[PDB]
Amino acid sequence: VGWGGSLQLVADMIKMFFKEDWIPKFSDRVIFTLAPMIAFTSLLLAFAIVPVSPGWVVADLNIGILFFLMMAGLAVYAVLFAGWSSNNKYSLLGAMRASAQTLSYEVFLGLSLMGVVAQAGSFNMTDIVNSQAHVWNVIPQFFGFITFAIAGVAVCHRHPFDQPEAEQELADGYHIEYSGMKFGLFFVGEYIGIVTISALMVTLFFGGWQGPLLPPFIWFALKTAFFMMMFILIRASLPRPRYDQVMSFGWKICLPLTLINLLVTAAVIL
Amino acid sequence: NDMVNWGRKNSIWPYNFGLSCCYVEMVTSFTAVHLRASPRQADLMVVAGTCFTKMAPVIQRLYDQMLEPKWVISMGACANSGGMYDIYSVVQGVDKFIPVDVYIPGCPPRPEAYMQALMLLQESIGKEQGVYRANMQSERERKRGERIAVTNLRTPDEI
Amino acid sequence: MIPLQHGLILAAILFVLGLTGLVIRRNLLFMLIGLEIMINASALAFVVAGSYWGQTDGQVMYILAISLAAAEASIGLALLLQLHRRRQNLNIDSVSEMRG
Amino acid sequence: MEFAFYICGLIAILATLRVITHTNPVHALLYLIISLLAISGVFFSLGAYFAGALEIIVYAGAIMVLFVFVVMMLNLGGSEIEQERQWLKPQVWIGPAILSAIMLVVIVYAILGVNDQGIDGTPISAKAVGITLFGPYVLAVELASMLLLAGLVVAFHVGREERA
Amino acid sequence: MTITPQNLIALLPLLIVGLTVVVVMLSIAWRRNHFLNATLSVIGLNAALVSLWFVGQAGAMDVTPLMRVDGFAMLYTGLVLLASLATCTFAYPWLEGYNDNKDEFYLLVLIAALGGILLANANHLASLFLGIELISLPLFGLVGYAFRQKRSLEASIKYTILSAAASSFLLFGMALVYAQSGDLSFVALGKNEPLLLAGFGLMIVGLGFKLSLVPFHLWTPDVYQGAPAPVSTFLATASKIAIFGVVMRLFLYAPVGDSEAIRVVLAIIAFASIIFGNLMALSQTNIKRLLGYSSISHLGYLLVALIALQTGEMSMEAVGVYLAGYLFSSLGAFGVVSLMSSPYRGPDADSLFSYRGLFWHRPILAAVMTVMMLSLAGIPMTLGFIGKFYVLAVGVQAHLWWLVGAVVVGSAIGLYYYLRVAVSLYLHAPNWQYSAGGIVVLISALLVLVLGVWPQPLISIVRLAMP
Amino acid sequence: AFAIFLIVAIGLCCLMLVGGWFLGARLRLSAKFYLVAMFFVIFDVEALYLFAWSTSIRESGWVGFVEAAIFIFVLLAGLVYLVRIGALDWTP
Numbered sequence A: 001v002g003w004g005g006s007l008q009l010v011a012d013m014i015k016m017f018f019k020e021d022w023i024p025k026f027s028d029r030v031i032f033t034l035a036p037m038i039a040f041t042s043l044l045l046a047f048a049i050v051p052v053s054p055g056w057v058v059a060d061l062n063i064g065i066l067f068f069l070m071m072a073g074l075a076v077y078a079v080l081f082a083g084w085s086s087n088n089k090y091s092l093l094g095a096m097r098a099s100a101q102t103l104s105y106e107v108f109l110g111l112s113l114m115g116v117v118a119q120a121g122s123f124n125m126t127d128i129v130n131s132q133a134h135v136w137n138v139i140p141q142f143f144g145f146i147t148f149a150i151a152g153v154a155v156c157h158r159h160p161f162d163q164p165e166a167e168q169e170l171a172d173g174y175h176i177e178y179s180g181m182k183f184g185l186f187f188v189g190e191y192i193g194i195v196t197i198s199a200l201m202v203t204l205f206f207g208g209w210q211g212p213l214l215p216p217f218i219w220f221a222l223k224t225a226f227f228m229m230m231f232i233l234i235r236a237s238l239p240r241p242r243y244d245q246v247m248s249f250g251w252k253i254c255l256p257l258t259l260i261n262l263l264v265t266a267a268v269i270l
Numbered sequence B: 001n002d003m004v005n006w007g008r009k010n011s012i013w014p015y016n017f018g019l020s021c022c023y024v025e026m027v028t029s030f031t032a033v034h035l036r037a038s039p040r041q042a043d044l045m046v047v048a049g050t051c052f053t054k055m056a057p058v059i060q061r062l063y064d065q066m067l068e069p070k071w072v073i074s075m076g077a078c079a080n081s082g083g084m085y086d087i088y089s090v091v092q093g094v095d096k097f098i099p100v101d102v103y104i105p106g107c108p109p110r111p112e113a114y115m116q117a118l119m120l121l122q123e124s125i126g127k128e129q130g131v132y133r134a135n136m137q138s139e140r141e142r143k144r145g146e147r148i149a150v151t152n153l154r155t156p157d158e159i
Numbered sequence C: 001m002i003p004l005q006h007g008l009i010l011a012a013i014l015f016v017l018g019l020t021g022l023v024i025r026r027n028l029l030f031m032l033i034g035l036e037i038m039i040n041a042s043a044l045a046f047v048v049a050g051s052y053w054g055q056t057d058g059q060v061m062y063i064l065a066i067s068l069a070a071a072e073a074s075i076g077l078a079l080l081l082q083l084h085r086r087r088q089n090l091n092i093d094s095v096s097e098m099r100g
Numbered sequence D: 001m002e003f004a005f006y007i008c009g010l011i012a013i014l015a016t017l018r019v020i021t022h023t024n025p026v027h028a029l030l031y032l033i034i035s036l037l038a039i040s041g042v043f044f045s046l047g048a049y050f051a052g053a054l055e056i057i058v059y060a061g062a063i064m065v066l067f068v069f070v071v072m073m074l075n076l077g078g079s080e081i082e083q084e085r086q087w088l089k090p091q092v093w094i095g096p097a098i099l100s101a102i103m104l105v106v107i108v109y110a111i112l113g114v115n116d117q118g119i120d121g122t123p124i125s126a127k128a129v130g131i132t133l134f135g136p137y138v139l140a141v142e143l144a145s146m147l148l149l150a151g152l153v154v155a156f157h158v159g160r161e162e163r164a
Numbered sequence E: 001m002t003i004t005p006q007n008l009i010a011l012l013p014l015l016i017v018g019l020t021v022v023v024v025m026l027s028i029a030w031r032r033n034h035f036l037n038a039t040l041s042v043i044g045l046n047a048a049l050v051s052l053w054f055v056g057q058a059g060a061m062d063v064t065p066l067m068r069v070d071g072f073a074m075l076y077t078g079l080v081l082l083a084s085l086a087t088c089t090f091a092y093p094w095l096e097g098y099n100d101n102k103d104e105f106y107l108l109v110l111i112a113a114l115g116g117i118l119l120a121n122a123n124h125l126a127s128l129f130l131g132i133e134l135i136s137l138p139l140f141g142l143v144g145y146a147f148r149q150k151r152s153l154e155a156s157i158k159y160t161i162l163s164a165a166a167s168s169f170l171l172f173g174m175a176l177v178y179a180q181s182g183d184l185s186f187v188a189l190g191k192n193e194p195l196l197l198a199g200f201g202l203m204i205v206g207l208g209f210k211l212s213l214v215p216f217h218l219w220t221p222d223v224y225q226g227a228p229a230p231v232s233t234f235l236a237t238a239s240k241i242a243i244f245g246v247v248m249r250l251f252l253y254a255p256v257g258d259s260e261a262i263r264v265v266l267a268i269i270a271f272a273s274i275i276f277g278n279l280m281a282l283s284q285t286n287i288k289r290l291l292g293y294s295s296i297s298h299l300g301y302l303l304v305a306l307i308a309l310q311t312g313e314m315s316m317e318a319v320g321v322y323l324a325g326y327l328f329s330s331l332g333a334f335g336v337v338s339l340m341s342s343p344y345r346g347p348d349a350d351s352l353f354s355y356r357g358l359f360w361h362r363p364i365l366a367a368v369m370t371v372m373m374l375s376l377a378g379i380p381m382t383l384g385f386i387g388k389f390y391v392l393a394v395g396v397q398a399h400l401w402w403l404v405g406a407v408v409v410g411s412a413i414g415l416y417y418y419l420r421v422a423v424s425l426y427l428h429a430p431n432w433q434y435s436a437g438g439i440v441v442l443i444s445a446l447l448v449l450v451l452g453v454w455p456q457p458l459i460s461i462v463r464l465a466m467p
Numbered sequence F: 001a002f003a004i005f006l007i008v009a010i011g012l013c014c015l016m017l018v019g020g021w022f023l024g025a026r027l028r029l030s031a032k033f034y035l036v037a038m039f040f041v042i043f044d045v046e047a048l049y050l051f052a053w054s055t056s057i058r059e060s061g062w063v064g065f066v067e068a069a070i071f072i073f074v075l076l077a078g079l080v081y082l083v084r085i086g087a088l089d090w091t092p
C-alpha cells in the first residue's frame, strides 16, 4: 500500500487530468475559464516572497507584504466570477454568501500583520528573518498570532465550511457546475494556500534560519512540517460553524482586538 | 507507461445513491473508510436500494451528468435485479437501462462487502467496461477450491 | 528615463476617457464607473507630479484621494441599491424630473 | 526599462479603450481591473513603490469588489441589451470624441512647451512616508478618518433596508 | 513642526466640532433620540462659537504647513458656524414629520461644519481638498435625505455625479501645477509658462462648479428644487461662503494670480455669471428655483470684487461684508420657505403662484420674506445695499468699467423678480422649536434692517478681522 | 529573478491549459444585504492609513500614539454605532 501521505494528493492531481470537458449552455465562457486561475495563480505567486535561502532567494524585492495583501484582496474575484459564471441563482447565491464571509474575514490579516511589521520596522523580508535571531515575535503578540491564524484559515480554506454546502435553503454550493480540471485547480490552489500561510507564519512570526545545531533550511522545513501537522489537527478538530455564528464572531470581536494590539505594541516599543 | 492506469486505480470518488433502506450499513462502511462526495464531480455511482419505476429517470439524469469514465456498482438484491419485489412497481434491476460493472449480492450487503467491491473495482480498473481477457475468471470460479475444501462448521447452539 | 510629459499625458488620456464615460452612458452604474476612472486619472496626475520633485509629496494626498474614492463609491452604490429597490428602471432618464 | 514602460502603458491604453467600447458590464469591470494593474505597474516603474501596491490592495481589491457585488445582484444581464446598442451608435460617439480631443491636444500642447529634465526611477521606501504622514500631515489623516466615517454613514443612510 | 499649546488653541474650532461628532455618534448608538441629538449637536456648534473668542486670544500663526490661521479665517469660521446653527434649527420642524431614522441629519451637518471650518484655514493645496470633500459628503447625502420622494433622489444623483466630476477636475489641475512648482503650498506656488497656467484653469473648473459660475451653474436650480429646505439653507449659504474664502486666499498669496492671463478669464466668467443669472431668473414661478437662480448672480458680484483684490486694499473688506450680508439675506428667505413646511408633508408645495396671500395667513413671516427679498436686490435700508456699494467702489477703484456696468445692468434686470415675490405676498388669499425657528428668522430680519440703516459696527468687526 | 519566476508560472499555466485542450430576473427578498462588504470597502481604506503607519512609528512617538488612539477610537465609535442601530447584525 502507499506509505506516503502526499501520494494521495499526487494521485488526485493525476486523476483530474485527462477528463472530458463539456461545454455549459447559457453560460459565459471567458469567466468560466478565468475564475480558476484567480484562485490558483494568486497563491502560486504568493510563494514568491518566502526567504528559502539568502543565496537562492526567489525574489530579492524590497516589499513582499503588500504583494501578499494584494493577493488576499484579489482572491475574492475567483469566488465572484465563479458565482456569476455558474449561471444558476442557487450557485450564484452560494458563491455570494461564500464571498460575503470571505470579505468579512479577510479584514483581519492586514491589521494583525501590522503588529509584527511595526516591531520589525521594515518590509524587506531579510530584515524580518534577521530580527528573530534571539527573541521571536510571538511572546508579546499572542492575540495577533491567533488573529492571523483565524484570518489565514478563513480565506476559502474550508474552515468556514460553506463552500461545498449551504446552511440556507433556496441556494446551493458553487462547486457543482465545475466538474473538469477546474475542481482540481481549486484543490491545488487551497493546498498551495495552506502551505504558504504556514510558511509565512513560520518565517514572519517565529524564527526562520536559526540553525542551533543543524543546518537552518531543514530547521525551517521541519518547523513548517510541525505547523502543517498542527494546522491539519485543528482543521479536523474545528467543527463546521454555521453562517450565523461566523457573522457573530467576525467584525465584533477581532477588530477591537487588533486595534488594542496596535496600541499595546506602539506603547511598549517607545 | 501506464501511469494513467495507476492514477485511476489509486484514487476514485464515490457518489452515494443509497435509498430509504439498505443505507445504514453503507453509512457504517462510509464512517469507517472516510462531505467530500459532490454531484457532477464523481466518476463512481454506487446504486443501492430498490430502483423504483417512478424515480428511474432521476437515476438516468445522474448517470448522464457524470464524466466520460463511468463506473457503476449495483449493491443489494433489490438493485442487481428486482430482488424479492417482482412487482409491477419495481423495475427488475438497474442494469436494464444503465450498464453495470460490479454486482454485490446481499440484502443488505455488509460494510466488508463494500470494501471488497472497492477491491474488485480497482482490480478491474487496473487491467487495461473492458474484459481485457482477464475478467472471464469469476469469483464463482476463482475461490471455488477454497470454498469446496471447507468441511466442518461450528454448531449453531453456541455464541 | 521618462520626463513629465509622458506621465501627464497618460493621466490626461485616462482623465478624458473617464469624463467621456461619465457623459455618454445612461446607466448610473456606468457613470459611477467613469467617475472612479477619472478620479484615478486625477490621482495619477498628482502622483507623477509628486514624484517629479523627488520627495515624499505624492503619497501624502494620494492615500486620501483613494479614501475619497472609496467613500464616494460606497455612497453611490448605496444610492443604486435604494434606487433599484424603489424603481426597476436603472436609466438616468427615469430620474429626469424638474426639467427647466 | 523603456520597452517595459511602453508595453505596459499600451496595455493600459488598450484596456481603457476596451472598457469604453463594450456593452456587457463584467467585461468592462475585468478590463478596468487590468487597467488598474497596469497603472500599478507604472507606479512601480516610476519608483512610487508605496503607490503601485497601495492601489491594488484597496482600489482594485475592495471598491471594484463592491462594483462586482452591485452588478451581480441586479442580474441586469439578459435584459435590456438591444436598445442600448441601438442608441450608442458610432455617429454619436464621434460627436463628443472630437470635443474631448480638443482638450487632449490642448493639454499636450501645454505640456510640450516645458523642458524635459528627466528623472530616473528613484526608489521611495515606506520608511519615509511613515514619517511624512506623521510630520506636517497628521490632521490630513484625522480629517480623512472623519471623511471615511461620513462615507460610512451616508452609505448606511441612502442604502436603507426595509421589509422588502 | 510639532504640537504646541498655541497650535491647539488655534485649532480649537476644528476640535470642538470633531468632539461633537463623536459624542453625537455615541448618543445615536445609545438611544437614537431626536431631542437629545438636536441638543447635543447645537451645543457643540455653540461651543465652537464660544471658542472663537479663545482663538482670537491667539495671533496670526500656522498650525501645520497645511493651514495658516489668520484673523481673516476667524470671520469665515463664524459665518459657517451660524449657517450650521441656522440649518439645525430649521431642520427640527421639518424632520418632526419624517417617518423614521430622524437622527442621522445632525451627524452629517456636523461633518459639513468640519469641512467648512477647514477651508477657512488654508495654506496648502491639500487642505483645500480635505475641505471641499468633507463638506460635499454631507451634501452628497443630505440632499438625498428623505429619498422617499421622486425628486430628492433625483437631485441627490445629479449633484453626486457632478460634484465628483468637479473634484476630479480640481485634483487633476492641482497636480499639473505642482509639476512646474516644487511645492503645492499657496505661498510657495508660482516661484507665466503655459503648464502652470493650464493647471490653474483646471482648478478654476473644479472650483467654479461649487461656486455656481456661468458654465457650471446647471446644478443650482435642480438640487435646490429637490433638496429639503433645511438642506437648502446650508447648501445656499455655508458651502459657498466657506468655499469663497479659500479661492480668494489662493489668488492673494500666489504670485501667478497677479498675472493678467488668469485675471481676464475670471473677469469674463464674472461678467457672464451676472448676465446668465439675471436673465434666466425672470421667468421662474418657483421660490426654490428662484433663490437658486439668484445665487449665481450673488457669486458673480463676489468675483467682480475678487478680480480687483490685487488693486487697492479695500477689496478685502468688500468681499467680507457682502458675504455677511448675503448670509443674513438667504438665511431669512430660506428659513421662511422651510417654516412654511412645518410638517414633513411629503413633497412641500412651494411656488410663486402658491405664495399668493401669505400676509393674511401669517403676517410676521411675510414681513421677513419681504425684508430679505428687498435686501437681495439692492434696495437701501438693507445690508445688501452696503455690500453692493463696496463692490461698485472696488470696480471703480480698479477701472473695470465693463464689470461694474454689468453689476448695474444686472441689478436693473434682477430687480424685477425680487419685486414680484415681494408684492405676491400681498395679493388676495387663494411647536416650541417652531417658535424657535421663527425666532431665528425674526432675529435675522432685525439684524439686516439695523445694519442697513446703521452699517458702521459691522465694518469695525471686518477691519478687526482683516490682516 | 522575479521576472523569470513569473515567466515560469505563466508558462506552466499555458502548458496545463494547452495540454488539457489537446488531451480531450426578479430576486425579491433573495440576496441583498451586502452592506457588510460595503463596510469592508470603507474599512480597508481606513486600515490603509495603518498600513502606511506601521512602517515608521519609533520616530513618531507620543503624539503619534495619541492621535492613533483617537483615530481607532473614532473607528470604534462608528462600529458600536453600526452595532446599536442594527446595521451590523445577522445577515442573509
Ligand code: SF4
Pocket (backbone or CB within 6 Å): B021, B022, B048, B049, B050, B075, B076, B077, B078, B079, B083, B106, B107, B108
Ligand atoms: S436489498 Fe434488502 S435492505 Fe436493501 S433495499 Fe432491498 S430489501 Fe431493503
